[PDB]
C-alpha cells in the first residue's frame, strides 16, 4: 500500500545527551496531557481498525473462540485419608474452590464436604490454611477474610459436618500444627490487637507468638508455647513430629531466607499439656540459609537445606550428639517439592524449566526416574504413614493433570487420577518436546517446542515467545491463547529461554545482564536460524511476540536480522532506553540496565537502543505494538515514540506499522476480564492474519 498517514510531527528539540545531540523530534508525546498526543493516538487506533476492517469477521470468530476458553472446571491433587478421597473442585462461575470426598477412585457423584462460599453473605472468605489430625475427626482450617485480621474462621466436622462452636481469632499467616486428640498450635500476638488503646495501623504486627488451642474449650484455656521476647520483629511457626510426641519450631527474621532450627519435646498425652514449654533443644541458632522440615525417624530428622547450596540440597540432622551426614548433595538444578514416605525420599527437580521426578531408597540414593510428561509440578500431597501419593503436572497444552501412584514400584502404578477438560481438546494430538541448540558462540540453549504429531511442514506458521530477564523464567503453564494457537490455526509454539531470566537463576542473570546482556539479543536471533535450518517452518513467514522486557527483545532482534522475520508483536515493553530512569518505576530495574549517565553503561546502551537503530532502506517485518495509555508499569511514551518515528522514517519498505492501544476513561482501577480478552483476541487475529495460519475448517 502507498496510502497517506498522519504526519507525525518532528521538532528541533534535541537534548544534547553526553555531548551528543541526539534529536528528540517527538517531545510532543512525552506526556499524555497534550492534545496532539491524544489525537495521534486516536489516528493510530483508527488506522489499525481500518486495516482490520475486512478481516474483522474472522477476528470476531477467533475472539469468540478464545473467550470460550475462560470457563473451565479445575480439580487438584487427591488424598486417600481414612478410606475416602478428599480433593478440590471448581465450577467456573464462582470465586473460591470447594472441597469434597469420594468413596473411591471411580466415584460417579461426589459428596460435598467444605464450601467456603456459603457461610458469609459476602462469601469472600477462603481456606487460607488446612490441617488434618491423627484421629482424623476434624479439619482445622483458617477462613481468611479480605486479608485483614478482622476475620471469621469456622470449623465443620467429618462424621457429621455440622459446625462446632469454636473459633480462632486474631491470627494472620498461620501454620496450624495439630497433635493427636488435644488440639493444635497457632499464631497470634499479645493484646489480641485490641482496639481502643490501639495504634501502628497494624504495621509489622510485632511480637509473633505461637500458643496451643484445644477444641471445645473457650479461648482463655490455652497455654502459650513460644514467643520471641528479645527479637519481637520476627515471624515463626511450628509443626509436630511424626511420632507426635515432639514439636519443632521454625523462625524467620523479616523475609530473609536464612533460618535457624529449634527442636522441642512435646509433653506426653498422659500429662495433658504441660504448664511450661519444655526445653526447646537448640540445634541451629544462626542465619545462614533457608531450612525446611520434611520428616524424621527416631533419632534422625531430614530437611531441605539451602545452606552453602543455593540449589537446595537435602540433608539429615541428628540431635543427641550433633554429628552430621548428607543425604542428597544438590544436583545441577533447583528444587520445587520434596517428600519423605515410608522408606523412600521422593524428589522433583526443576531441570531446564521442567520438573523431573525421582525416588530414592535408603541404601541406593540413585535418582531413578519416571516418564512423566514435560511440564512442572503445581501441587503436591504426601503422608508418611499413607503409601498412596499423588501430584499435579501443568504445561502449555496440558492445562492440568493429577496423577497418582504408590511407593513400591513407581513404574506401572503411575496413572491419571484426573484430567481437566476444556471444550475442543484431545491432548495427545499435540506433542511437546525440548531441544537444545548451540548458541552464537557455543553454549547450549534450550527450546520448548509444542507441535502436532508430524502434521506441520515448512509452510506451517511458527511462533516464538520470550521474556528473558529479571531472574523470572517463563515456566511451562497453560494459557488459553496458546490453546487457540495450537487447536484453531494449525500452528506450532516455540518458547525459548534466552539468557537473562531465572531459567538457571543468578548465573542465568549473569549470562545476560547489563554489560554482557547484548549477546543475549544475538543468541535469540541465532535461534531463528536453527528452527529454519532444522526444517520446522520457513523464514518466508514467521512470528515472534513477548512482553515487557520480552517486548523489548522482540524489537531488539530487529537490528541483527531485520529482514529475516516476517511479523512481530511487542507488548508493555521498554522502547526507549534514553528516558529510562527519568520516568515512573522504570529506574527500579537499574540492576538490569543502568542509568544513562554512567560512562560504560551508556556506551553499551547506545549501540542497541531501538529508537536509535531503526533505519530506512533496510527490510523490516510487520510490527505490532500494544500498549495501555496510562499503565504505570511501563509508561507508554516509548511505544508511541517508536511507532511514530518508524511510521515517518521508512514508508515504502518492510512493515507495516501497527499501534494497538488501550484508550479509555477511568485509569487507576482494576482491570476487568473484557479488556485482556479483547486485546488477546486482537493480537491473535493479527498474527493469524499475517503469518498465513490456516484456520481449522
XYZ file of C-alpha atoms in Angstrom:
697
model
C 0.000 0.000 0.000
C 1.047 3.591 -0.756
C -1.619 5.348 1.295
C -1.006 8.510 3.311
C -0.631 8.556 7.107
C -0.976 11.212 9.826
C 2.053 13.492 9.694
C 3.840 12.592 12.916
C 5.351 15.953 13.784
C 9.094 16.402 14.268
C 10.603 19.267 16.243
C 14.069 20.764 16.583
C 14.030 19.674 20.232
C 17.186 17.675 20.891
C 18.550 17.152 24.386
C 22.326 17.048 23.892
C 22.909 13.903 25.946
C 26.558 13.190 26.802
C 27.871 15.787 24.334
C 25.855 14.032 21.594
C 22.991 15.999 20.032
C 20.516 13.159 19.689
C 17.375 14.571 18.050
C 14.167 14.197 20.032
C 11.750 15.460 17.377
C 8.868 13.836 19.264
C 8.919 15.723 22.547
C 5.177 16.108 21.949
C 4.285 12.567 23.026
C 6.326 12.520 26.234
C 3.192 13.500 28.176
C -0.423 12.367 27.659
C -1.748 15.769 28.693
C -1.183 17.367 25.287
C -3.983 17.380 22.699
C -1.501 16.438 19.971
C -0.641 13.098 21.574
C -4.313 12.286 22.157
C -5.199 12.995 18.530
C -2.201 10.983 17.301
C -3.316 8.043 19.457
C -6.833 8.402 18.036
C -5.459 8.280 14.492
C -3.326 5.226 15.324
C -6.359 3.349 16.626
C -8.360 4.449 13.569
C -5.692 3.167 11.178
C -5.367 -0.180 12.952
C -9.150 -0.585 12.845
C -9.216 0.348 9.156
C -6.560 -2.268 8.415
C -8.533 -4.911 10.318
C -11.968 -3.918 8.973
C -12.006 -6.572 6.244
C -10.674 -9.386 8.454
C -12.969 -8.370 11.333
C -15.234 -11.348 10.578
C -12.538 -13.926 11.302
C -11.291 -11.639 14.078
C -14.655 -11.930 15.827
C -14.677 -15.675 15.153
C -11.309 -16.197 16.841
C -12.272 -13.757 19.608
C -15.305 -15.890 20.427
C -13.112 -18.989 20.252
C -10.555 -17.621 22.724
C -13.282 -16.251 25.004
C -14.904 -19.695 25.098
C -11.771 -20.956 26.896
C -12.234 -18.812 30.018
C -14.702 -21.080 31.866
C -13.163 -24.347 32.989
C -13.752 -26.791 35.847
C -10.420 -27.468 37.529
C -9.541 -30.212 40.011
C -6.481 -30.758 42.201
C -4.440 -33.457 43.906
C -6.330 -36.296 45.626
C -5.830 -37.503 49.180
C -6.746 -41.016 50.339
C -7.493 -40.441 54.030
C -9.465 -42.813 56.278
C -10.846 -44.663 53.265
C -12.063 -41.535 51.472
C -10.716 -39.415 48.616
C -10.579 -35.744 49.616
C -9.913 -33.320 46.771
C -10.782 -29.857 45.472
C -13.166 -28.812 42.699
C -14.260 -25.702 40.835
C -17.220 -24.994 38.561
C -16.158 -21.711 36.932
C -18.785 -19.127 37.852
C -17.655 -18.896 41.496
C -14.706 -17.181 43.158
C -13.320 -19.799 45.577
C -12.756 -23.542 45.363
C -14.758 -26.317 47.023
C -13.531 -29.402 48.879
C -15.232 -32.792 48.893
C -14.835 -36.526 49.343
C -15.402 -39.552 47.133
C -15.817 -43.171 48.164
C -13.256 -44.495 45.672
C -11.114 -43.774 42.635
C -14.053 -44.243 40.251
C -16.745 -42.310 42.129
C -19.541 -41.076 39.882
C -21.132 -38.423 42.130
C -19.003 -36.999 44.977
C -20.236 -35.682 48.341
C -19.664 -32.053 49.331
C -17.535 -31.539 52.440
C -16.311 -27.920 52.578
C -17.965 -24.984 50.812
C -16.319 -21.677 51.769
C -18.778 -19.799 49.536
C -21.803 -20.131 51.837
C -21.028 -19.194 55.446
C -20.580 -15.497 54.573
C -23.111 -13.161 52.970
C -20.230 -11.651 51.028
C -18.850 -15.161 50.677
C -15.362 -13.788 50.052
C -13.503 -15.734 52.742
C -11.337 -18.650 51.637
C -9.482 -21.588 53.156
C -6.099 -19.988 53.754
C -4.674 -22.960 55.666
C -5.621 -26.547 56.440
C -4.628 -29.377 58.761
C -5.857 -32.916 59.391
C -5.408 -34.736 62.705
C -4.127 -38.078 63.948
C -7.669 -39.150 64.820
C -8.922 -37.518 61.589
C -12.010 -36.330 63.468
C -11.785 -32.683 62.392
C -10.143 -30.498 59.729
C -8.667 -27.337 61.238
C -8.830 -24.676 58.543
C -8.381 -20.905 58.557
C -11.081 -18.783 56.894
C -9.291 -15.584 55.903
C -11.488 -12.585 55.115
C -10.372 -9.611 52.967
C -6.747 -10.016 54.055
C -7.086 -8.025 57.272
C -7.246 -9.827 60.611
C -10.899 -8.785 61.099
C -11.984 -12.251 60.111
C -14.442 -15.069 60.699
C -12.831 -18.513 60.937
C -15.047 -21.578 61.269
C -14.890 -25.378 61.511
C -17.035 -28.209 60.115
C -16.606 -31.832 61.194
C -16.384 -35.034 59.135
C -18.644 -37.657 60.721
C -21.474 -35.102 60.898
C -20.092 -31.961 59.141
C -22.074 -29.539 61.235
C -20.146 -26.571 62.640
C -18.872 -26.624 66.226
C -18.763 -23.569 68.491
C -15.033 -22.896 68.236
C -13.158 -20.011 66.597
C -9.510 -18.989 66.248
C -9.343 -15.189 66.396
C -6.642 -12.573 65.738
C -4.300 -14.567 63.506
C -2.558 -13.854 60.208
C -0.211 -16.058 58.180
C -0.931 -19.027 60.416
C 0.585 -22.508 60.339
C -1.845 -24.780 62.178
C 0.029 -27.597 63.927
C -2.206 -30.430 65.150
C -1.248 -33.096 67.692
C -3.411 -36.182 68.400
C -6.726 -35.545 70.116
C -5.940 -32.462 72.208
C -5.579 -29.681 69.644
C -3.226 -27.512 67.609
C -0.684 -24.735 67.956
C -1.445 -21.476 66.140
C -0.038 -17.966 65.773
C -1.269 -14.728 67.347
C 0.010 -11.692 69.231
C -0.297 -10.342 72.778
C -3.192 -7.950 73.495
C -5.121 -9.596 70.600
C -4.547 -6.372 68.622
C -7.340 -4.955 70.746
C -8.787 -1.602 69.763
C -9.450 1.468 71.957
C -5.788 1.528 73.046
C -4.505 0.630 69.578
C -2.189 2.289 67.078
C 0.513 1.496 64.485
C -2.099 0.764 61.760
C -1.339 -2.979 62.045
C 2.185 -2.398 60.738
C 4.537 -5.393 61.071
C 2.368 -6.940 63.826
C 5.162 -7.056 66.366
C 5.749 -9.922 68.819
C 4.716 -13.005 66.903
C 3.558 -15.588 69.412
C 2.512 -19.233 68.966
C 0.179 -20.810 71.529
C -1.782 -24.058 71.820
C -5.551 -24.418 71.438
C -7.848 -27.285 72.423
C -11.232 -27.706 70.747
C -14.341 -27.496 72.902
C -12.796 -25.199 75.479
C -13.094 -21.396 75.421
C -10.272 -19.252 74.087
C -8.836 -18.479 77.532
C -7.900 -22.084 78.406
C -4.742 -22.177 76.305
C -1.053 -22.457 77.168
C 1.468 -20.290 75.345
C 4.277 -22.281 73.727
C 6.724 -19.749 72.251
C 7.009 -16.014 71.670
C 10.342 -14.439 70.736
C 10.862 -11.897 73.544
C 14.159 -10.292 72.583
C 13.507 -10.057 68.808
C 9.757 -9.364 68.561
C 10.203 -8.138 64.972
C 10.272 -11.743 63.705
C 7.791 -14.343 62.455
C 7.735 -18.003 63.444
C 5.653 -21.137 63.098
C 5.663 -24.667 64.422
C 4.809 -28.236 63.491
C 4.674 -31.642 65.154
C 6.853 -34.716 64.768
C 5.668 -37.883 63.062
C 5.735 -39.578 66.458
C 3.600 -36.584 67.542
C 5.438 -36.708 70.875
C 7.836 -33.888 69.911
C 7.299 -30.437 68.440
C 9.613 -28.394 66.250
C 9.551 -24.650 65.641
C 10.886 -22.683 62.676
C 11.561 -18.950 62.838
C 12.214 -16.250 60.271
C 13.592 -12.723 60.504
C 11.644 -10.499 58.139
C 11.535 -12.187 54.742
C 15.190 -13.249 54.791
C 15.638 -16.823 53.507
C 18.063 -17.519 56.350
C 16.645 -19.788 59.042
C 17.567 -21.410 62.360
C 16.329 -24.776 63.606
C 14.942 -25.389 67.107
C 13.522 -28.742 68.205
C 11.461 -29.479 71.304
C 9.954 -32.305 73.345
C 6.168 -32.056 73.418
C 4.743 -33.299 76.739
C 3.185 -36.738 76.586
C -0.540 -37.463 76.426
C -0.765 -38.806 79.985
C 0.014 -35.324 81.363
C -2.290 -33.300 79.106
C -0.424 -30.157 78.127
C 2.428 -29.104 80.382
C 2.349 -25.887 82.385
C 5.652 -24.628 80.944
C 7.091 -25.112 77.448
C 9.712 -27.821 77.853
C 13.328 -27.282 76.878
C 13.494 -26.360 73.194
C 16.733 -28.074 72.231
C 18.957 -25.813 70.151
C 20.405 -27.379 67.008
C 20.928 -24.440 64.651
C 20.958 -20.900 66.048
C 22.197 -18.915 63.063
C 21.021 -17.221 59.876
C 22.833 -18.927 57.012
C 20.091 -20.231 54.733
C 16.537 -21.478 54.384
C 15.673 -24.758 56.100
C 12.508 -26.814 55.712
C 11.496 -29.856 57.748
C 10.383 -32.897 55.773
C 10.333 -35.793 58.221
C 12.022 -37.709 60.997
C 12.809 -41.242 62.095
C 13.620 -41.779 65.765
C 16.973 -40.083 66.337
C 17.045 -38.580 62.825
C 15.424 -35.590 61.139
C 15.545 -34.610 57.472
C 15.428 -31.163 55.885
C 15.656 -29.320 52.618
C 18.615 -27.005 53.193
C 19.883 -24.035 51.190
C 22.908 -23.548 53.467
C 26.144 -23.455 51.412
C 23.968 -24.514 48.453
C 21.594 -22.085 46.684
C 20.163 -25.106 44.830
C 18.523 -26.562 47.962
C 20.415 -29.722 48.825
C 18.801 -32.286 51.149
C 20.453 -33.246 54.429
C 19.768 -35.216 57.605
C 20.316 -33.930 61.156
C 20.885 -35.727 64.461
C 20.077 -34.295 67.883
C 21.654 -36.319 70.686
C 25.224 -35.709 69.537
C 25.145 -33.382 66.520
C 27.449 -35.252 64.135
C 26.113 -34.838 60.639
C 25.760 -36.607 57.290
C 24.484 -35.598 53.840
C 21.663 -37.385 52.029
C 21.491 -35.614 48.663
C 24.073 -33.096 47.566
C 22.428 -30.585 45.272
C 22.136 -31.551 41.615
C 22.626 -29.352 38.565
C 19.190 -27.783 39.110
C 16.955 -26.343 41.808
C 14.154 -27.836 43.918
C 10.396 -27.418 43.605
C 8.921 -30.002 46.001
C 10.097 -32.939 48.089
C 8.661 -35.586 50.381
C 9.690 -38.477 52.620
C 7.382 -41.503 52.781
C 7.991 -44.939 54.330
C 11.412 -45.983 53.016
C 11.856 -43.536 50.148
C 12.731 -39.895 49.624
C 10.713 -38.644 46.659
C 12.059 -35.569 44.903
C 11.240 -33.258 41.999
C 13.892 -31.256 40.140
C 13.275 -28.130 38.043
C 15.691 -29.280 35.348
C 15.695 -26.992 32.279
C 12.383 -25.447 33.407
C 10.610 -28.784 33.814
C 10.035 -30.944 36.872
C 11.522 -34.440 36.761
C 10.576 -36.977 39.427
C 12.901 -39.350 41.258
C 12.565 -41.876 44.070
C 15.495 -42.691 46.348
C 15.817 -45.668 48.682
C 17.758 -45.731 51.954
C 20.786 -47.655 50.666
C 20.972 -46.683 46.974
C 20.453 -42.927 46.559
C 20.451 -43.224 42.771
C 17.901 -40.913 41.174
C 15.586 -43.437 39.490
C 13.157 -41.509 37.297
C 9.615 -41.859 35.954
C 8.445 -40.994 32.398
C 6.118 -38.203 33.455
C 5.296 -35.790 30.611
C 7.004 -32.476 30.007
C 5.699 -29.897 32.453
C 6.061 -28.782 36.045
C 4.644 -29.517 39.480
C 1.796 -27.289 40.605
C 0.673 -29.176 43.729
C 1.790 -31.989 45.998
C 0.262 -34.164 48.698
C 2.113 -36.835 50.653
C 1.773 -38.503 54.048
C 4.456 -40.621 55.685
C 2.036 -43.237 57.023
C -0.024 -43.426 53.802
C 1.570 -45.390 50.966
C -0.614 -43.562 48.429
C 0.981 -40.500 46.819
C -0.098 -38.057 44.134
C 0.930 -34.893 42.310
C -0.176 -32.466 39.604
C 1.559 -31.536 36.334
C 0.832 -28.462 34.251
C 2.245 -27.474 30.856
C 1.335 -25.449 27.772
C -1.103 -27.904 26.178
C -1.617 -29.721 29.448
C -3.921 -27.389 31.385
C -3.703 -29.594 34.461
C -3.374 -33.296 35.186
C -3.415 -35.005 38.575
C -1.530 -38.309 38.690
C -1.258 -40.846 41.495
C 0.789 -43.917 42.397
C 2.297 -45.992 45.209
C 5.815 -46.197 46.622
C 6.627 -49.859 45.940
C 7.467 -49.913 42.208
C 6.698 -46.497 40.687
C 6.932 -47.720 37.077
C 3.455 -49.060 36.312
C 1.452 -47.626 39.218
C 1.600 -44.162 37.650
C -1.819 -43.255 36.277
C -4.033 -40.263 35.516
C -6.216 -39.645 38.569
C -7.886 -36.637 36.959
C -7.732 -34.729 33.679
C -9.299 -31.298 33.340
C -11.471 -30.704 30.285
C -11.800 -27.619 28.097
C -14.024 -27.943 25.043
C -12.112 -28.847 21.890
C -9.008 -30.707 23.066
C -7.595 -34.204 22.676
C -4.192 -33.628 24.372
C -2.182 -36.445 22.782
C -2.555 -34.928 19.312
C -0.359 -32.007 20.458
C 3.047 -33.355 21.486
C 5.537 -31.151 23.318
C 9.298 -31.595 23.290
C 12.521 -29.897 24.308
C 15.578 -29.395 22.132
C 18.999 -27.890 22.763
C 20.916 -25.960 20.126
C 24.288 -24.252 20.103
C 24.399 -20.531 20.824
C 26.174 -17.865 18.778
C 29.469 -18.827 20.454
C 28.691 -22.397 21.516
C 26.814 -22.747 24.822
C 23.744 -24.982 24.815
C 20.431 -23.111 24.711
C 17.117 -24.904 25.362
C 13.887 -24.635 23.395
C 10.392 -25.895 24.297
C 8.529 -26.675 21.063
C 4.901 -27.826 21.036
C 3.578 -29.176 17.759
C 1.278 -31.805 16.288
C 2.062 -35.460 15.511
C 4.140 -34.545 12.478
C 1.319 -32.633 10.751
C 3.288 -29.427 10.078
C 5.925 -28.579 7.484
C 7.852 -25.642 6.027
C 4.514 -23.924 5.337
C 3.112 -24.047 8.874
C 3.095 -20.791 10.870
C 5.800 -20.730 13.551
C 5.577 -18.512 16.644
C 8.233 -17.603 19.206
C 7.549 -16.342 22.736
C 10.183 -14.901 25.042
C 10.551 -12.551 28.001
C 14.053 -13.399 29.240
C 15.050 -11.174 32.127
C 14.660 -10.071 35.726
C 15.541 -13.552 37.029
C 11.952 -14.699 36.362
C 11.702 -17.641 33.928
C 8.685 -18.454 31.781
C 7.792 -21.803 33.308
C 5.550 -24.154 31.298
C 1.975 -23.245 32.189
C -1.283 -23.296 30.271
C -2.651 -20.192 28.581
C -5.879 -20.127 26.596
C -4.194 -18.056 23.880
C -1.660 -20.811 23.200
C -4.580 -23.250 23.234
C -6.270 -21.373 20.385
C -2.936 -21.124 18.581
C -2.478 -24.892 18.729
C -6.024 -26.078 18.022
C -7.570 -23.367 15.821
C -4.949 -22.468 13.208
C -2.558 -25.418 12.890
C 0.461 -23.546 14.206
C 3.305 -24.640 16.460
C 4.624 -22.819 19.524
C 8.350 -22.418 20.173
C 9.283 -20.881 23.537
C 12.992 -20.205 24.002
C 14.518 -19.265 27.352
C 17.102 -16.713 26.231
C 19.815 -15.629 28.662
C 18.692 -13.188 31.331
C 15.800 -14.860 33.127
C 15.579 -17.269 36.019
C 15.944 -20.434 33.971
C 19.325 -21.056 35.609
C 18.957 -18.459 38.378
C 21.537 -15.838 39.309
C 24.030 -17.453 36.934
C 21.447 -17.101 34.163
C 21.058 -13.441 35.098
C 24.847 -13.079 34.972
C 24.897 -14.604 31.489
C 22.560 -11.911 30.153
C 22.573 -8.804 32.358
C 23.940 -5.294 31.859
C 27.253 -5.117 30.004
C 27.221 -8.784 28.964
C 23.496 -8.610 28.141
C 23.934 -7.596 24.493
C 24.906 -11.030 23.178
C 21.565 -12.281 24.523
C 19.754 -10.431 21.744
C 22.238 -12.059 19.367
C 21.561 -15.601 20.567
C 17.797 -15.299 20.145
C 18.401 -14.310 16.523
C 20.550 -17.411 16.100
C 17.531 -19.376 17.286
C 15.550 -18.134 14.303
C 18.265 -19.643 12.128
C 18.201 -23.039 13.832
C 14.438 -23.519 13.687
C 14.623 -22.844 9.946
C 17.771 -24.884 9.337
C 16.300 -27.950 11.047
C 13.200 -27.850 8.851
C 10.382 -26.666 11.116
C 8.715 -23.973 9.062
C 10.225 -21.396 6.747
C 11.713 -17.908 7.172
C 9.340 -16.692 4.449
C 6.686 -16.326 7.171
C 7.305 -16.426 10.936
C 6.077 -14.650 14.071
C 7.521 -13.558 17.418
C 5.982 -11.839 20.415
C 6.784 -11.105 24.042
C 6.036 -8.816 26.937
C 7.753 -6.101 28.980
C 11.477 -6.794 28.688
C 10.484 -9.520 26.248
C 8.611 -6.873 24.299
C 11.980 -5.144 24.242
C 13.862 -8.167 22.912
C 11.428 -8.893 20.078
C 12.229 -5.352 18.947
C 15.968 -5.534 19.650
C 16.222 -8.577 17.378
C 15.015 -6.198 14.671
C 18.609 -4.918 14.481
C 20.694 -8.047 13.919
C 18.442 -9.729 11.320
C 15.968 -7.031 10.241
C 14.835 -8.884 7.113
C 14.709 -12.432 8.470
C 11.432 -12.261 10.386
C 8.040 -11.529 8.870
C 5.873 -10.295 11.761
C 6.475 -9.435 15.422
C 4.406 -8.173 18.360
C 5.679 -6.243 21.388
C 3.544 -5.571 24.468
C 4.040 -3.312 27.525
C 7.747 -3.192 26.695
C 10.504 -0.655 27.147
C 11.058 1.055 23.807
C 13.380 3.970 24.678
C 16.436 3.479 26.879
C 17.271 7.199 26.871
C 14.294 8.176 29.062
C 14.699 5.044 31.169
C 15.361 6.252 34.717
C 13.717 9.664 34.275
C 10.139 8.350 34.436
C 7.883 6.101 36.563
C 9.154 2.995 38.395
C 11.403 2.048 35.487
C 14.584 3.087 37.286
C 13.829 0.326 39.801
C 15.306 -2.100 37.240
C 18.734 -0.415 37.289
C 20.321 -3.807 38.036
C 19.271 -4.830 34.522
C 20.016 -1.649 32.541
C 21.733 1.138 34.479
C 21.343 4.893 34.314
C 22.096 6.794 31.080
C 24.702 8.925 32.859
C 27.292 6.276 33.745
C 30.006 6.175 31.096
C 30.388 2.481 30.279
C 26.704 1.715 30.848
C 25.669 4.362 28.314
C 28.421 3.220 25.949
C 26.956 -0.287 25.948
C 23.386 1.041 25.836
C 23.671 3.465 22.916
C 24.539 0.756 20.367
C 21.278 -1.182 20.771
C 18.601 1.342 21.792
C 15.634 0.577 19.499
C 14.785 4.241 18.963
C 18.326 4.922 17.701
C 18.606 1.966 15.315
C 15.509 1.881 13.093
C 16.915 2.919 9.749
C 15.445 3.370 6.272
C 16.123 1.269 3.182
C 16.519 -1.991 5.112
C 13.763 -4.621 5.173
C 11.602 -4.956 8.298
C 8.869 -7.378 9.401
C 5.291 -6.419 10.185
C 5.368 -4.754 13.592
C 2.561 -4.607 16.158
C 2.945 -2.773 19.453
C 0.147 -2.977 22.025
C 0.137 -0.575 24.942
C -2.075 0.968 27.606
C -2.187 4.749 27.601
C -1.758 5.202 31.376
C -0.296 1.920 32.652
C 2.324 2.883 35.235
C 4.188 -0.436 34.934
C 5.821 0.892 31.752
C 4.835 4.406 30.676
C 3.510 4.319 27.084
C 5.560 7.230 25.743
C 8.221 4.832 24.445
C 5.782 2.840 22.319
C 4.340 5.979 20.735
C 7.847 7.295 20.042
C 8.842 4.043 18.337
C 5.703 3.712 16.233
C 5.642 7.359 15.138
C 9.345 7.506 14.256
C 9.307 4.458 12.034
C 5.907 5.454 10.651
C 7.587 8.621 9.381
C 11.013 7.240 8.554
C 10.770 4.141 6.284
C 7.438 4.390 4.436
C 7.756 2.156 1.367
C 9.801 -0.670 2.906
C 9.093 -3.743 5.017
C 6.291 -3.313 7.527
C 3.693 -2.009 8.003
C 3.261 -0.246 11.363
C 0.553 -1.326 13.818
C -0.139 0.516 17.065
C -2.805 -1.315 19.067
C -3.587 0.777 22.123
C -5.748 0.779 25.234
C -7.566 4.123 25.430
C -10.454 4.577 27.863
C -11.738 6.581 30.834
C -11.119 5.762 34.479
C -7.468 4.818 34.998
C -6.339 3.786 38.469
C -8.845 0.953 38.996
C -8.704 -2.779 38.417
C -8.584 -4.460 35.036
C -11.747 -6.422 34.157
C -11.539 -9.541 32.020
C -13.115 -7.815 29.000
C -10.034 -5.714 28.238
C -7.500 -8.550 28.427
C -9.760 -10.922 26.497
C -10.415 -8.459 23.664
C -6.735 -7.482 23.452
C -5.658 -11.125 23.255
C -8.251 -11.698 20.547
C -6.942 -8.717 18.588
C -3.286 -9.726 18.772
C -4.033 -13.339 17.910
C -6.192 -12.439 14.931
C -3.337 -10.195 13.779
C -0.778 -12.984 13.923
C -3.194 -15.493 12.386
C -3.759 -12.996 9.572
C -0.183 -12.186 8.703
C 1.939 -15.326 9.174
C -0.546 -17.267 6.986
C -2.190 -19.546 9.544
C -4.781 -21.969 8.180
C -7.947 -21.937 10.279
C -9.358 -25.301 11.351
C -12.285 -25.585 8.953
